[PDB]
Design a protein around this nucleic acid. Structure first.
Ligand code: NA
Ligand code: NA
Length: 331
DNA sequence: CCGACGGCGCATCAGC
DNA sequence: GCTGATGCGC
DNA sequence: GTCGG
């Protein structure tokens, strides 16, 4: 259950700025993660907060954050923020990172080499790599929320081609999209083939082939990176005659060994909080999970040998939990 | 006090 | 050349 | 930055 706007947005928002600043400008992921974490739980939090103490209570919340929360309650702002908002470099530094391929080093490098806008980018592509190129290119597309309708749509295309290419494959769209989301950010493609498993001799072709196909059929426009197992690229929906071009979008496809799929599936489907809790119970029944497998916890304190997973269920099976519907994997 | 905090594929870079 | 290390995104 | 050894 989550309410939150006229409630604690002021806070969650400030925090997010904070987080960004750490990541991008700071180069402190942990700190970004920390601020995000705080931002989340408080998001979920049913009350009109009234102080830090109140929030301290939150798990994630703490001293400094709560300190902030007081100024903010009191002032309606965070002074830190104003100097940050007013500091040149920082902002530009935060902006550029928006650009897919551009991280904090690049972004800071650029800003030092004077570059600090799309333009500068545009006027400097000899100074960008591919990934960065496509990202600059697709800048607005990417930040576009994707529509499930489309998702569905997109969902269908990717779905058949694979089917066209080979019949034995398996794919599945994961993410919020799997969780039943009205909208998404990208398309996570989870796939595998029978001929591809754990101790098996890999067919790059497999993945290859699925790409090409989707390529062949002008589904996937660009290509961020690709190798025997992972492919990250740009894809689009064929334009309806006299109907303006939709947006281009993120899509990644992942190939997995059949023995680890569901784990992968399960893993990749989320939620994140869900995974945590699950990791927990699964543990309670004496096992340790991950993206790949499920292991029987050692009678000692830890002990190898992964179990036979033929489904998501099975997973659920081992830990004595009802096979949850991806829909309610909210946690 | 102090370490962990997800890890990994894939591209490009520093080096030998 | 290639190895490993670093950036990036997921 | 927060949590927890
Ligand atoms: Na706390
Ligand atoms: Na970026």
């Amino acid at each position: 259950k989550a309410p939150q706007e006229t409630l604690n947005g002021g806070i969650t928002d400030m925090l997010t700025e904070l987080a960004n600043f750490e990541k991008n400008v700071s180069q402190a992921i942990h700190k970004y993660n920390a601020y995000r974490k705080a931002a989340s739980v408080i998001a979920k939090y049913p009350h009109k907060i009234k102080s830090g103490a109140e929030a301290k209570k939150l798990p994630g919340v703490g001293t400094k954050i709560a300190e902030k929360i007081d100024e903010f309650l009191a002032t309606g702002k965070l002074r830190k923020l104003e100097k940050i908002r007013q500091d040149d470099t920082s902002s530009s530094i935060n902006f550029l990172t928006r650009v897919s391929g551009i991280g904090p080093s690049a972004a800071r490098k650029f800003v030092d080499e004077g570059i600090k806008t799309l333009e500068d980018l545009r006027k400097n592509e000899d100074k960008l790599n591919h990934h960065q190129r496509i990202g600059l290119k697709y800048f607005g597309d990417f930040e576009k929320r994707i529509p499930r309708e489309e998702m569905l749509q997109m969902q269908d295309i990717v779905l058949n081609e694979v089917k066209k290419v080979d019949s034995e494959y398996i794919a599945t769209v994961c993410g919020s999209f799997r969780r039943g989301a009205e909208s998404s950010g990208d398309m996570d493609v989870l796939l595998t083939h029978p001929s591809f498993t754990s101790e098996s001799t890999k067919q790059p072709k497999l993945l290859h082939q699925v790409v090409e196909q989707l390529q062949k059929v002008h589904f996937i426009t660009d290509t961020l990176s690709k190798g025997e197992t992972k492919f990250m690229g740009v894809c689009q929906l064929p334009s309806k005659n006299d109907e303006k071009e939709y947006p281009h979008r993120r899509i990644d496809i992942r190939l997995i060994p059949k023995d680890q799929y569901y784990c992968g599936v399960l893993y990749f489907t989320g939620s994140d909080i869900f995974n945590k809790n699950m990791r927990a119970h699964a543990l309670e029944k004496g096992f340790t999970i991950n993206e790949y497998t499920i292991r029987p916890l050692g009678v000692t304190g830890v002990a190898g040998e992964p179990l036979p997973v033929d489904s998501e269920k099975d997973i659920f099976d081992y830990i004595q939990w009802k096979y949850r519907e991806p829909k309610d994997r909210s946690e």
